[PDB]
Design a protein around this ligand. Structure first.
Ligand code: ZN
Ligand code: ZN
Lengths: 681, 142
């Protein structure tokens, strides 16, 4: 009963007959002769529910499963040809139906499919033209979270399987494997479906990209060209973001956490120097995973960004040399800061501002710090110390720039600060320099700050971290069901405390004291009050801070690779404390070795410590209770022998992560002295 | 005088007629060194489709040495990424023939013949500060 295209009813004709003749080979003949043909499939239907019913009926028979598999293996390689050489989709926009039909098969993630069928199908799918991908992604964004999870898992298992099954090395790169690259491009397709399927707030949260004006030389060249007003061009934008019209930064809440898209096995194998090269220089035969940033973990991303920073620092060094050769002028290749311990903030401001005004490109040189009166080579330890001092001084309540919350242990901008916009610019620049120099800072900002840095205004929902006493109160106000005007007697006027403790009345709306808050306007009031606290009360200071930060990061791939939650990790470091990795990378000095009894007892003790004792131990040994990007294993801790057994406590040099440990006579004594040191420091 | 910021001629031919003079008659200073251009350089400035820069109503051009120097510096400073012409056409949804590309070494706009050469020799186009550049025949041969 041969037929050129297939439907649910046509299938039922055979379900009954095959059961009645106790056979399956005719239905197998049919399904093979159907699903091996792209045209038959494209013509067969969009009828999602019918497809779902059909699969739910057919996949109940093992013999038929092998036929689906065997048909798919035949189908995909031909579809790749259609898309690559015949542009079939441009002739028939229904061609996409084929992929929709296949993807509703629930068994694609069983190993039988992973070895051959799914890879081939990925090769075909990953060639779809952008407009088609956009059509497909928009459909997927309507699916249930578990279904996104299934699709994500379907490709995740494949990427995992191929990474585990193949031997990758510095001569056989993951970038050269069509199967993993194709799978990643598919997974990217799912990723954007997850983005678009989440909650997206685009109309009330955009802030202008403020760019620092370049040096006079580049300005003159821009003036010699027709570009006097075209200073704003944006970073490298992803084609899919253009086709969909929604950025990764626009989604407030996805269906599945972005972290689940990270493929750890892949990250363990990927060589970032080469990937960054392929990201910068397009080669027809090689792919770059940086074009698929959702799949990389923060360590891998940071290593890419570090290659960018270092390649730029090196470019600026070349420019310095070229200027010296052609014009004789001698410029410093480093961002050499010289400051006095009694005037760190002032010296740093004047110097960084003179540098920013004379040459805004200098801020992109490698940082090098010198304390006036002290002598040493800045191998990072002097810089780290400089950052500690600056951060401590800037957050001192006596400077009035920031308010500290005892509950969350987070800092927030003081609306009442009379201090000049200079200091705010300085702290902004410092944060930039810290990322640029891969140094963790003990700064404690709520998530809103990193969102505002990325160009998104803080929304009501961001108060959940910065002002819990406020967020809760506003949430209560929204949840109340009585007459807000009679029951709460609040107006569009609010009270703020001045440095001198005086309550300053601020009108959210003109003559706000005469305007009552009603149930119809309360959501607007909350939006305005949130906008006041998160924006319009600090906007004077915050705008300066943000400017300072962009002066260092304006050309960085930062806006493309990272998200607010990942910026925090770059600046402050991670909260996950793997002491096994720390043991594996710890170095020994003064005659200790990894095989020393005292050292083995030390690791037994430290592994037996509580997480709080562990945080204290890190704070004591390193100056921060957080682990760098990549965990404690990246922290080159040095355990150096500080003489024989004594009653003294151990001591530390936080600028170089050195622990000065006496050679105690017993495990109990070591434990008691170490606990006492880390508790009483 | 050209002391009106908005209403002074931009391209050398226009400045010739505005000063009732010809390209064969006019003498101009280079905006960096304020040295006088050789007539050969003046012609090339007209051929390179560059803009007159004005300071206090005075016109300035750019000589060959300065232009090459500052362009090379700008390459070293604002290089972004390099694409194949084919890929570039897809990113901008236009054929390379129509897209504005200048010489990275000497700013001269690239002819469709030179653009084709880039495609023929599988050579990439470089994005600098957000504008696209390639290498003209007189700079790929040197
Ligand atoms: Zn000159
Ligand atoms: Zn040229």
């Amino acid at each position: 009963k041969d037929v050129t295209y297939l439907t649910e009813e046509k299938v039922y004709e055979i379900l009954e007959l095959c059961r009645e003749r106790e056979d399956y080979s005719p239905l197998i003949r049919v399904i093979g002769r159907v699903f091996s043909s792209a045209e038959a499939l494209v013509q067969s239907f969009v009828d999602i529910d019918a497809i779902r019913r059909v699969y739910t009926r057919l996949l109940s028979n093992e013999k038929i499963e092998t036929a689906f598999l065997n048909a798919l293996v035949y189908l995909s390689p031909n579809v790749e040809c259609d898309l690559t050489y015949h542009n079939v989709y441009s002739r028939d926009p229904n061609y996409l139906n084929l992929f929709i039909i296949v993807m509703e098969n629930r068994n694609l993630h069983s190993p039988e499919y992973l070895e051959m069928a799914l890879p081939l199908f990925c090769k075909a799918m990953s060639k779809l033209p952008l407009a088609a991908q956009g059509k497909l992604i928009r459909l997927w964004s309507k699916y249930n979270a578990d279904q996104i999870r299934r699709m994500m898992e379907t490709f995740q298992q494949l990427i995992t399987y191929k990474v585990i099954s193949n031997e990758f090395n510095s001569r056989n790169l993951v970038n050269d494997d069509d199967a993993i690259v194709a799978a990643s491009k598919c997974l990217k397709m799912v990723y954007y479906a997850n983005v678009v399927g989440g909650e997206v707030d685009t109309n009330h949260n955009e802030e202008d990209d403020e760019e620092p004006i370049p040096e006079s030389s580049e300005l003159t060249l821009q003036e010699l060209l027709g570009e006097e007003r075209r200073n704003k061009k944006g970073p490298r934008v992803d084609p899919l973001e253009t086709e969909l019209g929604v950025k990764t930064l626009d989604c407030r809440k996805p269906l599945i956490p972005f972290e689940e898209f990270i493929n750890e096995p892949l990250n363990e194998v990927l060589e970032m120097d080469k990937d960054y090269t392929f990201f910068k220089v397009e080669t027809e035969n090689k792919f770059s995973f940086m074009t698929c940033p959702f799949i990389l973990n923060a360590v891998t991303k940071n290593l890419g960004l570090y290659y960018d920073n270092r390649i730029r620092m090196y470019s600026e060094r070349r420019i310095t040399v070229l200027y010296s050769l052609v014009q004789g002028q001698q410029l410093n290749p480093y961002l050499r800061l010289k400051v006095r311990r009694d005037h760190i903030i002032d010296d740093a401001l004047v110097r960084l501002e003179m540098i920013a005004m004379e040459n805004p490109a200098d801020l992109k040189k490698q940082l090098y710090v010198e304390f006036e009166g002290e002598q040493g080579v800045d191998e990072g330890g002097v810089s780290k110390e400089f950052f500690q001092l600056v951060v401590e001084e800037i957050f001192n309540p006596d400077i009035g720039m920031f308010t500290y919350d005892e509950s969350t242990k987070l800092f927030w901008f003081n609306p009442s600060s009379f201090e000049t916009e200079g200091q705010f610019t300085l702290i902004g620049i410092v944060l930039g320099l810290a990322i640029y120099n891969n140094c963790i800072l003990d700064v404690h900002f709520p998530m809103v700050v990193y969102r505002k840095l990325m160009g998104k205004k803080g929304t009501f929902r961001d108060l959940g971290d910065s002002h819990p006493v406020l967020y809760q109160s506003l949430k209560d106000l929204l949840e109340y069901e009585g007459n807000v005007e009679d029951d709460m007697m609040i107006t569009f006027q609010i009270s703020q405390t001045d440095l001198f403790g005086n309550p300053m009345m601020y009108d959210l709306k003109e003559n706000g004291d005469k305007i009552p808050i009603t149930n119809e306007n309360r959501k607007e009031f909350v939006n305005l009050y949130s906008d006041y606290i998160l924006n319009k009360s600090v906007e004077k200071q915050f705008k300066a801070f943000r400017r300072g930060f962009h002066m260092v990061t304006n050309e960085s791939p930062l806006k493309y690779l990272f998200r607010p939650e990942e910026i925090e990790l770059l600046i402050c470091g991670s909260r996950n404390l793997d002491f096994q990795a720390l043991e594996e990378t710890t170095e020994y000095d003064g005659g200790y070795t990894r095989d020393s009894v005292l050292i083995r007892e030390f690791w037994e003790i430290v592994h037996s410590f509580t997480d709080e004792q562990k945080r204290l131990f890190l704070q004591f040994t390193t100056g921060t209770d957080r682990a760098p990007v990549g965990g404690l294993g990246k922290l080159k801790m040095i355990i150096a022998k500080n003489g024989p057994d004594t009653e003294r406590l151990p001591t530390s040099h936080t600028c170089f992560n050195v622990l000065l440990l006496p050679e105690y006579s017993s495990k109990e004594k070591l434990k008691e002295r170490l606990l006492k040191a880390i508790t009483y420091a | 005088m050209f002391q009106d910021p908005q209403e002074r001629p931009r391209k050398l031919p226009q400045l010739c007629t505005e000063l009732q003079t010809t390209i064969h008659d006019i003498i101009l200073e280079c905006v960096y060194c304020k040295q006088q251009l050789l007539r050969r350089e003046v012609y090339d400035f007209a051929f390179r489709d560059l803009c007159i820069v004005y300071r206090d109503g005075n016109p300035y051009a750019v000589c060959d040495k300065c232009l090459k120097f500052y362009s090379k510096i700008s390459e070293y400073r604002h290089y972004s990424y390099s694409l194949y012409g084919t890929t570039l056409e897809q990113q901008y949804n236009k054929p390379l023939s129509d897209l504005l590309i200048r010489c990275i070494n000497c700013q001269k706009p690239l002819s469709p013949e030179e653009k084709q050469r880039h495609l023929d020799k599988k050579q990439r186009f470089h994005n600098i500060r957000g504008r696209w550049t390639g290498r003209c025949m007189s700079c790929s041969r040197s």
